[PDB]
Amino acid sequence: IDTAAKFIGAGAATVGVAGSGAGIGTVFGSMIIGYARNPSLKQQLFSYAILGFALSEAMGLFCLMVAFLILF
Amino acid sequence: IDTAAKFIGAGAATVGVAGSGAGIGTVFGSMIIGYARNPSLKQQLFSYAILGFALSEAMGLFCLMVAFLILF
Amino acid sequence: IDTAAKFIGAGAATVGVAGSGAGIGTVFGSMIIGYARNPSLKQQLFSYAILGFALSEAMGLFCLMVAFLILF
Amino acid sequence: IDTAAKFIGAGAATVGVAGSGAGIGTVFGSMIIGYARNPSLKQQLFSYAILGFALSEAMGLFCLMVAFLILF
Amino acid sequence: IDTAAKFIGAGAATVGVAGSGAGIGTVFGSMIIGYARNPSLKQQLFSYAILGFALSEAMGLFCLMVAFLILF
């Protein structure tokens, strides 16, 4: 009975990552137009691409944390 | 039946982070371009992104707190 | 079974606060790109973000108060 | 059983106000980079700001009247 | 059981009116920034907004029109 409820509560939990599938799409598309204006990539402009990536994947993967706990 | 509806009850409320999961991609994709134009980040131009991040990651774990309080 | 719908109803009703997640990621990122071009923040530039934060927040906590009032 | 379908769809409708929470963010966000170039604020900037605010509301509020229509 | 399929089709179809409410925040956001370049506003600058606003809401009402068919 809850065997399906094990599934859909996990099956609905996974689509909360679908933000951060696009949220890193911003920060890499928004870097090349920050770069073509000003070619100083070895400075802190590329260092704000990864911290923006890591802080977005930090809110990315832990939405799949609640997916497995409903399963296991 | 109390247990099973809880299992899908927290599954729908997982995706409340999906707004903050990409809303943190925009504001950290808008300081790549605001530091590119005018290099004055050490003033307000970095502390307006973390203050942008505090008041937007206040709402990512805000909803998963409800998905816990519906589970236990 | 009556409480079973009380739990899954607030499960999707708090997804409406995710709309105040990604909608606030812009209006705090737009005070980055539009600050460097014109340093006049103590005038109505910061004040039109606080109006832009709070009245965007008011549709966040309103879709939180549905999840309380559906359950009780 | 009649209360089972009522209590889900009232929560299933109010995810429609999340999309209004997104579109309301740009209207106080683009006016930030709109006024930042051109300080002619007391003219039709703000008059185009308030019209933009109260029109995205009417695509969020119109579902909410339909949302209370489901319960009654 | 015959009543319960009426309300899921009522609740889940009304969700899609959120998306077009996000779209008319863009076009009314973009008319604020287009005017701040070139004050030729009462010409086809503002008229393209009422071109675009009617065309996006026509999609969102087209989403909402199946909510009255499938419920009845």
Add this chain to the structure above:
Amino acid sequence: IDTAAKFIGAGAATVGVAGSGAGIGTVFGSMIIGYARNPSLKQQLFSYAILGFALSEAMGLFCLMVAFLILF
């Protein structure tokens, strides 16, 4: 119960036009801020924004076509 599976699917597949609803709201949010630099209007500025609309709404309209086959 056999008729219930007809009803549950189309209201779910309804929402695949919500993003395509906002996917035409931004192609008109460009031509405001696109024309306001370069008045070359009747030429291929407007003729391209026609093509972007009818292509994107067709991919929203095919999402409504599968809603009918689930309905019928």
Add this chain to the structure above:
Amino acid sequence: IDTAAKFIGAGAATVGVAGSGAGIGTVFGSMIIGYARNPSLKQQLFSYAILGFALSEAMGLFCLMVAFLILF
């Protein structure tokens, strides 16, 4: 009980293509502002939009093929 799963499955699997149209409006909404800055149409700019429509729709149209195997 097999019929009650096949029809909710594909209609759930159609939801994602709304994500595709909401980015595919940007890839022509950047070419409107692209050609209106620098008339470089017949060279590599327009062909990128031909790649840009072809790429993101392949992220979209595969999700429709996911709906078919649930239906078949």
Add this chain to the structure above:
Amino acid sequence: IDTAAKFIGAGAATVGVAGSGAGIGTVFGSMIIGYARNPSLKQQLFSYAILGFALSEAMGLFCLMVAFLILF
């Protein structure tokens, strides 16, 4: 009940893999506005797009194994 539970956890997971299509709309699309300001084409400009294109797809093909993790 077995094949009933499996498939509606599988279709509701594949929604998240078109949740990263809306990012490569920005990644492949914001190359346009960068290329027109500066034609340094075979520099890191097109190659930063590949760091965007295959990292945003890396959240797209993330969840697709997790869907086939619950197919079996």
Add this chain to the structure above:
Amino acid sequence: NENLFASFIAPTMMGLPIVTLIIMFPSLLFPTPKRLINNRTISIQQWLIQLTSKQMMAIHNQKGQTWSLMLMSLIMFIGSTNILGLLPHSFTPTTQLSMNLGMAIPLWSATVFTGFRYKTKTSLAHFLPQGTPALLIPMLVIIETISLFIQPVALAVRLTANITAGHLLIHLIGGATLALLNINTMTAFITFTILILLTILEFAVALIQAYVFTLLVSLYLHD
């Protein structure tokens, strides 16, 4: 119906073997010389510190610079104990959620008690942002305090949840190679997906910048 993927059902085990050996082991990877010129393998460890000691120094610029000689020890431990585990059968202590709740809370509460022993009023009068309007005092100070106590949970749970999320895609994409005794063309493409994914899993260094740095901002803001 050409290429049928397979799967294998097997429990994915984060067991708990003898840990207090495994913690001490990435200390002895780094030696320290008592000499002027060194021996060209410490010398590229000694240079790597003198970079990122010049970025957690520059922001603060106070007499809170005394704290910063510890924060570069915090970056080498979870910089190493996240990079050792990529090996075939090794075990990471930052996988388990236990120690990370002992890395956040004795550090996070070391910050709010830093200004409360010197300032005593204006440390949490940072709750007052601006030239106070009337309509939104109670809507503010119930928000900016609920986003304060989230910070220890926000600091630890972001580390444990994505580190282990790297390890499962290592297994599951890897385990689907072993159970691919069907058509042999698709075996290479899953293998080529792995050796890309192991390059992405050297973002386990990138996730230590986002632990020392939001500890600095959570130190610079309070002090």
Add this chain to the structure above:
Amino acid sequence: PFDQMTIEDLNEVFPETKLDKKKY
């Protein structure tokens, strides 16, 4: 002395101090 001589004999000319002297 040698290039690789000592870590204390080079600690006469180039200086050391007490706690919190070198700001940068």
Add this chain to the structure above:
Amino acid sequence: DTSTWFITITSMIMTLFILFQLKISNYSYP
């Protein structure tokens, strides 16, 4: 996995921060 009971590792982490404050303390000046 979802492990339990926690009496383990955390007492073996603060012994490690007697090691790392011993090695890194003997570093030099540019």
Add this chain to the structure above:
Amino acid sequence: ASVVPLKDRRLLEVKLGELPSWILMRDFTPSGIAGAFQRGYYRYYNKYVNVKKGSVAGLSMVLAAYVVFNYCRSYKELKHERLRKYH
């Protein structure tokens, strides 16, 4: 037995990968400048040639020891072996 294991690392540092400075060790420091990396080289095939000042064979032996040490604990759980040998 403490002076037994402590004299293992001080032999597998100053010869395999280490021999720092601080005179009373100055010519012992240049003993690592040629290095025993030429002695450590021949195990792989030839390919890790970059060990000159970033020394691979100095480090990649400990990490090859820590893998096969952790292969022993996992052996009890993932048995899988039939009443035979593999290919």
Add this chain to the structure above:
Amino acid sequence: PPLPEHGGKVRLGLIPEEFFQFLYPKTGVTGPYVLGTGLILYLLSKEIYVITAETFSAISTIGVLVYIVKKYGASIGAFADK
């Protein structure tokens, strides 16, 4: 795409030539090698014992660590500079 196809063909030919050269070198050294065939048995006997599992990701985490030995010959300049 045509340009990409031509380059691939060129790459394919060069690799074959390199392989032939390697084979000739291997052929020459046939008499004097007494190292590998002493230890090729323990990796043939233990591989007849237990060592097969879901660890084809053992090689790919050892394959990526070979590509960094390429840049390690440039890491000596970053090392010996200081």
Add this chain to the structure above:
Amino acid sequence: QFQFTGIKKYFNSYTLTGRMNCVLATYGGIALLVLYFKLRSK
């Protein structure tokens, strides 16, 4: 031990605020108890 007087000038400087593991210790004790409590009721 001499793992003290090398870093003893450092300790009473910052352990005035840094050595507040009491909160950490209190949390740990409580955590052990709840786990025992749920295994007591199985």
